[PDB]
Amino acid sequence: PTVVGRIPVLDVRPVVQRGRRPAKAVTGESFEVSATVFREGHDAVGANVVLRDPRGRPGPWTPMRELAPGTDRWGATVTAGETGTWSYTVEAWGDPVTTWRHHARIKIPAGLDTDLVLEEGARLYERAAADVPGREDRRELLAAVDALRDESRPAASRLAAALTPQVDAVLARHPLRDLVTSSDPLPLLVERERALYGAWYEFFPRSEGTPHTPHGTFRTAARRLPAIAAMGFDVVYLPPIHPIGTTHRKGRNNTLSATGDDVGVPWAIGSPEGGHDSIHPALGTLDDFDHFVTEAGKLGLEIALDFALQCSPDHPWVHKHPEWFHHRPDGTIAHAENPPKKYQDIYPIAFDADPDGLATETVRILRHWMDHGVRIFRVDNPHTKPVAFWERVIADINGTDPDVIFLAEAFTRPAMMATLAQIGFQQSYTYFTWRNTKQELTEYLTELSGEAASYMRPNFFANTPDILHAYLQHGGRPAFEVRAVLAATLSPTWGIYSGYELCENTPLREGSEEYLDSEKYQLKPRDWTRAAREGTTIAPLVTRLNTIRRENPALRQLRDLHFHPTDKEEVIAYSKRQGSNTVLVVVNLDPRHTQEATVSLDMPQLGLDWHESVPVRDELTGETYHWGRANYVRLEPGRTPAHVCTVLR
Amino acid sequence: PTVVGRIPVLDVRPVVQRGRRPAKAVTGESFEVSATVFREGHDAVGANVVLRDPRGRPGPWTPMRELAPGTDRWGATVTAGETGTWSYTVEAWGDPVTTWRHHARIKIPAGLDTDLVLEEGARLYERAAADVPGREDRRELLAAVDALRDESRPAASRLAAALTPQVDAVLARHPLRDLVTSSDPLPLLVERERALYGAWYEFFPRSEGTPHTPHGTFRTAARRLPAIAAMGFDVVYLPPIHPIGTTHRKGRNNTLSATGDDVGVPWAIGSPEGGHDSIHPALGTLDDFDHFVTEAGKLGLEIALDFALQCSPDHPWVHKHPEWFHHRPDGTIAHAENPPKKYQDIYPIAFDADPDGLATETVRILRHWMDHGVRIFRVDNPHTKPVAFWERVIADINGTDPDVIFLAEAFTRPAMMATLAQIGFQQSYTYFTWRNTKQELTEYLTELSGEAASYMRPNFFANTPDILHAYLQHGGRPAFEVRAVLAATLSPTWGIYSGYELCENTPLREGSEEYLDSEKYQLKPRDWTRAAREGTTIAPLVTRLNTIRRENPALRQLRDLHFHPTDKEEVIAYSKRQGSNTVLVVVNLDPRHTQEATVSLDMPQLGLDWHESVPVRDELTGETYHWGRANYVRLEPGRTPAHVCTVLR
Ligand SMILES: OC[C@H]1O[C@H](O[C@H]2[C@H](O)[C@@H](O)[C@@H](O)O[C@@H]2CO)[C@H](O)[C@@H](O)[C@@H]1O
Ligand SMILES: OC[C@H]1O[C@H](O[C@H]2[C@H](O)[C@@H](O)[C@@H](O)O[C@@H]2CO)[C@H](O)[C@@H](O)[C@@H]1O
C-alpha cells in the first residue's frame, strides 16, 4: 500500500501536533480547511471538504478553490455546529468536465476534430447525469447531451448548449468526480461560544465592604454585580476565595512582614481554617458563595474562579502530604519564585513523588467548585507546573464535563504558551499589554488571527493587578479609552481588572508595572457613585463597546481580520467580517496629540469595488459618514479615541 | 497516556509527510536533527539525539544545544553510516547540575545559606558519580563531593572545587539527566554516495559513428568513453537505446514528417523490432551493450539508462495491451503533449484500466536492464504518470535492490517536484538553468540546501538537449565557463549534455531554448580532435572542476553552504565546508564585462575571528592569496570566470 493516493491530497490544515491533538472551533465559528491537491498530467482537479459530526454524519457539499495561482494550495470555509469531537476530510478528484470544456472552447472554433470532441463531452455529461438525484436537473443535463450529439446543428451551437447557466448550476452542485481520493481524517474539538467570545471583569470581593465591616463579604460583594452586568460583561473573575496563610504573610505594597490588620494576598492559599476547597471565613460560608453565584447567574454573569496550585506554609497539605513539596536537606521548603519576583508567602508544589495523588486531589477540588456552579477556571501560572499534568487534568474534567473552560495565565515564552493551548486550555492570556505601537499590534494580531487560531483563543485583559503598562501610566484617561477599544475590537474575548474604568494609573515607582498600594496586599474601597456622577469613569465607553460587540457578529470572532493602510504611524485601521456584518475601526494610538490621517481601504477585502462608496455609522457617536477608497480622519485624544464603524447594509 | 511527556520534546525535524515517509541521507553525510525542548518552571534542560542503525544499535552521545536564545529550539549534527533504514529519537531531560551551578555562583558570594547550598551540590554530584563507569572519573567527582562538604574550608573555595575543568569534562561526557523523555522515532533512509554526489555526462551513441557508417553503434560509441572519464565524470546518461517508431516519426529540427533517411527521436520508443526491453538494431545487440557497459565500468563510469514510459504508435504494446492507452470514441489514441509542446510521434500511457499489469511489466523491464549492470535510471517526465505508480515501482525495485537510483526529470510546479522526491526519487532535476542572477542563485540554493535537502537531492545539468538558456545564447564561451563553475560548486551532483564543452549556443530561433539542428532529430558528428588541438573546448576547465570536487569533501555535500556579501550585483560569493575542508568561490555572473568588487567574508561563518587573515589557493590557476574580512577581486570574462579557492591548512 502506498502513502499517496490516486489523486494527491497532502498536508491538510489545520493540524495540531501532527494530528495527535485536535484543532479547535466553537459553535457557529467559521474557518478555512486547506490542502495541497494536484494530479499527474495536465488535466484539472477539484476538491471538497467533508466535515463529520460526533455521530459521524457528513455536512453539506463544500467545494474548495485554489487559493493562489500556480500554488496547488486549495481551501474552503466550513462552520462548526453542536459541541463535541468532529472530524474532517478533504476529497480530491479529477475534473474531466472542466478539462473537456477548456479543450472544446479552443478546438471547436479551430475546427479540430469537432465530432469527436462533442461526442466525448456527451459521454461525460451522461455519466454526470446518472449520479444526479434531482429529476429536473437530470433532464437538464440529458437535454445538453442530446444537443451535443445533434449532428444536424453547427459545432459552436452544439457546444454552447453544454455551457449554459443552468447546466453550470447543476454541475456546480453535482460534479462528475473522477478517481476520488481522501485524506485520513483529522480531529476537531468544538466547544461552547464562551470559550471564544465573552467580556470579563476582575474584582476582589473583600474590597467591597462597609463602614462597620471594611472586609467585604460575598453578600456585600454581590451588590457590585448589577453594575458589572450593566457594563455588558459576561464573566466575573474572582481572585482566590480561600483562607489566607499567616506565616510570611505579605504587608501593604509587597512588603515582607504583615502587621496586625494586614489581610495578605489571596494567592497565599491555606491555613488551619481550610485550603482550596474552603471559603475565607471573612467572606462568609459556602451558602453565601452559592448566593453570590445565583445572583450572578440571574444577571447573565458566569463566575470564573482562580485556581492556583500552590500553598501557604500553613496549608494543611504541608503536613498532610509533605511529599507534594521539595524539601532541602535541612527539611525546609524553598519559597516559590518568578525572578526577579519572589513569593516568600507561598511554597510551590512538587509533582514527581506523588503525581497520581496530586492529580486526583486537583480534579476533586475542581469538581467541588463545579458542583457549586463554577464552570470556568482561571489557572494561575500554569507554566510552573508540568505540561502533561495540565493535559491529564483538563482531559479528566472535560471527559465528564465538556462545558468547563480553562484560561491559562502564562506570560512566558511562545513555545510553552502554544503548547499549553494545544494540550487543552480553551483560552490563553497573551502579550497584548506589551503590544502598544501600530507595528506591534499589527504583527501580534496577524499572528493570533492566523494559524494560531486553530489552537489558541486569546483573552485580552487591557490590565491586570500585576500589569499596569507604561502606556497607561503616561497616557492617562485617553490611553485607557484606546486600549479598551483595541482589546474589545481585536479579540472576541477581552477583560479589565476593577479600577481600570477609573483610569487608575499610579505605579509603585518609575519603570514598574505594579500599581501603587496594590489591591493584592490591601482592601481597596472605591467611591463608584461619585465617579459616576462626576464623570471620572470610562464605564459608559466600556458599556457601549460591549453593546456594539453584542450587536455585531463580526466582533464575536477572531480569524477574520484585516489591516488597512494609513499614512500615519500613530493611526491604525482594521476590519472584521461575519456574514454581511462588517465592522471598520480606526484608532489613534497617540494619547497626547490629535492625529489626522488618510485611511486607504482595501475595498475588495471589504467585498466592494474600488470606486464604491459605502455608508458607515460610527457606533461610538451615532454619526454617519460615507466612506470609500481614501478617507480623511481627525481624532482628538479625550474627545475621540477612535472610530468604531459598522458598514450599513 | 498523555501526548506530551514529562519533559516536553516537540516537533522533531527533519520530518517528511508527518513521518509517513523517511527523511534522506547518504553514507558519511552530516545533517542537523532539531526539536523544541523546554520544561516547566525555571530550571535548566538538556537534550541529545539518539541515532539508531538498521540493527537498532545506538550511535554515540550527541548532545544538543539551543540554536538561538529564547527560541527553545535545540539542534545537533548527526552522520549517517551504512545504507539501510535507520531511525532517530530526541531525548530531553532536566539538567539539575547546570541549575545548581547557576544558583551556587550567586548565593555563595552573597553568603546566603552556604552550608545548605553546598550540601545540595554534593548530593547532586554523588548521584552523578553513581552512574560514571570510569574509576578515575568517579574518583574525580567523589573528590569534589568531599571538598564541597568540607566545612572547615571557605565557601568560595569549597565551591570552586566543584567547577574545575576536569569536573566539567566528566560531566560533559556523563551528565546527570533528570526525567528523561523521548520523542517517537522518525525514519531515515540512508542510501549510497552516488545518490548525492557524482558528475554526469549525457551523449547520444548514434552520433559517434564513422564516415562509412554514420549511425554509430555501441561498439563505436564506446570510443568516446575514455574522453568522458578523462574529464572526471562518474555517470554516463544515454537517451533511449530502443527501436524507434516509423509512424509520425519526426524529421530534422522537430519537423512533422521525416524524410527517408531521418533517424527520428529516441523517445519515440518501439517498433516491430522490439520495445523497452530491446536494443535499436543500428546500435547493435544486447551483447554489444554488455561490452559498452563493461568498458564503462573499467573506466569508473556507471551507466544511467533513460526510462520513458510511453510508446511510439508501432510499439507492440499498442496491439498487445490496448487498455494501456486511452482511446477516443473513434478508437484513435491522442498523441502525448506538454503544452505548448506536442509529441505527435508518441502515445501516453493510461493507468486506470490495468494498473497491476503496468506495474508488473515496468519492474520486469527495469530488472532486465538491472541484470545487465544498469543501476541508475533517468526517468523521463515522471509527473505525467501517477505519483502512486512511481511510489509503488520504486518501492518494489528498491525492496530487492536498494542501490538502484532514480532521477526524476520533472520540470513542473513545486508541489509535484517535492512529492516525487518524497515518495522515493533519489534525485531530482531542478530549476537551475532558469536561475542566472545573484538573487535567483542565492534564493534557490538557500531553498535547496535547507529543509528541502531532507527529501530532495538535486542534479544540476547546466544544459540538456531541451534546454539552451538565453544566458548561454547571449553569453558565449564565458557564459559556459561560469555555469560550469556554478553547477559544479553548488551541487554535489552536476551534469552537462555533449556539445556544452564546445560552447554550442545557436538556438532554433530568437527566444527559444531549443538548439538549432537538435541532436534529438539527427545524427550530430563532432570533430572532438580539432576542438582539442585548437583549444575551442572548455573540456580542460570541466576536467579541473571535477578534480577539485574529487579533492575537496566540501563540494561533495549539499547542506553546508553560505553566501558572503559583495558590493557588486554581478559578483557572487559563497562557501562550503566539510570537516576542515573549506571551499570559497567568487563568480562574476557578467559574461561581457570585467567586474571588480569587494567581497566581505562572514569570518565566523568560516570559523575564524573577524581580524584573522587566512591564506587561500585559487585551484583554477594555482595562485595563492591571503584573504580576510574584506577583499578586492577583479574578474575578466574569458580570462577568469571565477575564483574557486580552498582555504589552506
Ligand atoms: O501570594 C503569592 C503572590 O501573589 C501575587 O503574585 C501572583 C500574581 O498576582 C498572579 O496573577 C500570578 O502571576 O502568580 C503570582 C502568584 O500566584 C503577588 O503579586 C505576589 O507578591 C505574592 O507573593
Ligand atoms: O519522441 C518523443 C518526443 O521526445 C522529445 O521530448 C522529450 C524530451 O527530450 C525529454 O527531455 C522530456 O522533455 O520528455 C520529452 C518526451 O519524452 C522531443 O524533444 C519531442 O520533440 C518528441 O516528440
CATH code of the domain containing A590: 2.60.40.1180
Do B467 and B456 lie in a common domain? Answer: yes
Chain A interface includes B356 (CB < 8 A): no
Asked whether the beta carbons of residue B116 and residue A179 sit closer than 8 angstroms, the reply is no
Q: Is B618:B625 a contact under the CB 8 Å cutoff?
A: yes
Alpha helices in B469-623 (DSSP H): 470-475, 477-490, 528-534, 539-551
Q: What is the resolution of this structure in A?
A: 2.1
Contact B349, B324 (CB under 8 A): yes
Residue A248 CA to ligand 1 center (angstroms) comes to 14
Chain B residues with CB inside 8 Å of A41's CB?
348, 383-384
Strands A405-409, A376-380: pairing is parallel
Which class for B81: exposed (0-12), middle (13-18), buried (19 or more C-beta within 10 A)?
middle
**Bond from prior residue into B340 cis (ω within 30 degrees of 0):** yes
| Helical pair A114-131 and A96-110, crossing angle rounded to 10 deg | 160
Contact B38 A328 (CB under 8 A): no
Where does ligand 2 bind, in terms of residues with CB under 6 Å?
Answer: B 250, 254, 265, 267-268, 308, 343, 345-346, 380-381, 465-466, 520
Residue type (1 letter), A566: T
Q: How far apart are CA B418 and CA A13, in angstroms?
A: 18
Give the C-alpha separation, B34 to B75, whole Å.
Answer: 4
The bound ligand whose nearest atom lies closest to the alpha carbon of A464 is 1
**Structure obtained using:** X-ray
Give the domain CATH number at B22.
2.60.40.10
Query: Which residue in this structure is represented by grid cell 536533527?
Result: B33
- State the angle between helix axes of A135-148 and A114-131 in degrees (0 to 180), rounded to the nearest 10: 170
**Phi and psi (nearest 5°) for B103?**
-70, -40
State which of B238, B252, B267, B515 you would mutate to test the pocket of ligand 2, scoring each by most atoms of that ligand within 8 A of its C-beta: B267
Please give the grid coordinates belonging to residue B298. Answer: 573499467
Same domain, A404 and A435: yes
- CA torsion sign for B420, B422, B423, B429 is positive
Identify the three-state secondary structure at position A40.
coil
Judge if A138 and A252 occupy the same domain.
no
Q: Which three cell numbers stand for residue B463?
A: 544544459
Classify B102 as helix, strand or coil. Answer: helix
What is the rounded distance in angstroms from the CA atom of residue B468 to the CA atom of residue B500? 9
Using CA atoms, how far apart are residues B484 and B544, in angstroms rounded to an integer? 11
Cβ atoms of A504 and A537 within 8 Å: the answer is no
Omega prior to B322 cis, within 30 of 0: no
Q: What is the 3-state secondary structure (H, E, C) of B123-179?
A: HHHHHHHHHCCCHHHHHHHHHHHHHHCCCCCCHHHHHHCCCCHHHHHHHHHCCCCEE
CA distance A303 to A225: 11
CB B459 within 8 A of CB B491: yes
* CB contact burial B8-23 (16+ within 10 A = b; e otherwise): bbbbbbbbbbbeebbb
Residues B531 and B644 in one domain: no
**Pick from A618, A542, A647: nearest CA to A230:** A542
Contact A388 B4 (CB under 8 A): yes
The Cα A234–Cα A376 span in angstroms is 12
Contact B243, B270 (CB under 8 A): yes
Q: Could you say which of B526, B559, B592 is where a domain stops?
A: B559
**Best to test chain B binding among A4, A145, A326 (most B CBs inside 10 Å):** A4
Gap between the Cα atoms of A378 and A464, Å rounded: 13
Same domain (yes/no): B166, B178 = no
CB A68 within 8 Å of CB A153: no
Report chain B's C-alpha Rg in angstroms.
30
Q: Residue B540 CB: number of other CB atoms within 10 A? A: 12
Residue type, B336: A
> What spacing in Å lies between the alpha carbon of B208 and ligand 2's midpoint?
21
Residue type, A507: P
CB contact under 8 A, A5 and B392: no
Alpha helix segments (H runs only) across B265-354: 286-298, 317-320
Tell me how close the Cα of A84 comes to any Cα of chain B, in angstroms: 20
**B182 and B46 in a common domain:** yes
Residues A435 and A530 in one domain: yes
For residues A488 and A577, state if they share a domain. Answer: no
B326 burial type by CB count under 10 A (0-12 exposed, 13-18 middle, 19+ buried): middle
C-alpha cell at B307: 526510462
Interval between CA B267 and ligand 2 midpoint (Å): 6
A331 touches chain B (CB under 8 A): no
Whole-Å CA distances, B512 to B129, B381, B462, B519:
73, 20, 16, 16
Three cell numbers, residue A365: 477540588
Contacts of residue B251, defined as CB under 8 A and 6 or more positions apart, other chains included, come to B257, B258, B259, B262, B521
Number of domains in chain B: 4
Domain span at residue A613 reads: 560-649
Q: Do B413 and A123 touch (CB under 8 A)?
A: no
Residues B529 and B585 in one domain: no
Query: CA–CA separation, B37 vs B69, rounded Å?
Result: 13
Half-sphere exposure of B71 (CA within 13 A, CB side): 11
**Listing from the earlier edge strand, what are the strands of the sheet with A623-628?**
A562-564, A571-578, A581-588, A642-647, A613-618, A623-628
**CB B96 within 8 Å of CB B124:** yes
B42 touches chain A (CB under 8 A): yes
Any idea which ligand is nearest the CA of A515? 1
Distances (CA, A) of A243 to A217, A280, A283, A318, B472: 13, 4, 9, 15, 83
In this structure, the residue with its CA closest to atom 10 of ligand 2 is B380
DSSP state of A627: E
CATH code of the domain covering residue B281:
3.20.20.80
**Ligand 1 contact, A347 CB (< 6 A):** no
Q: Which of B42, B182, B387 to mutate to test the interface with A (most CBs of A within 10 A)?
A: B387
Q: Say if A18 is an interface residue toward chain B (CB within 8 Å).
A: yes
> What count of other Cβ atoms lies within 10 Å of the Cβ of residue A649?
8
Q: Which residues of A329-361 are buried (b: 16+ CB within 10 A; e: fewer)?
A: eeeebeebeeeeeebbbbbbbbbeeebeebeeb
Which residues does A527 contact at the CB level (< 8 Å), separation at least 6? Answer: none
Residues A308, A161 share a domain: no
Residues B444/B450, Cβ–Cβ less than 8 Å: no
Question: Is the separation of the CB atoms in A579 and A605 below 8 Å?
Answer: no
Q: Are A525 and A207 in contact (CB under 8 A)?
A: yes
B446's grid cell: 538557500
Residues A109 and A205 in one domain: no
CATH number for the domain harbouring residue A164: 1.20.58.80
C-alpha A376: how far from its chain's center?
A: 15
Strand B45-52 with B84-94, pairing: antiparallel
Contacts of A8 in chain B (CB under 8 A): 387, 415, 419
Judge if B453 and B482 occupy the same domain: yes
Q: How far apart are the first and last CA of chain B?
A: 54
Please identify among residues 376-435 of chain A the ones whose CB lies closer than 8 Å to any CB of chain B: 383-388, 391-392, 395, 413, 415-416, 419, 423
Residue type, B396: D
- Give A-chain residues touching B423 at CB under 8 angstroms: 2-4
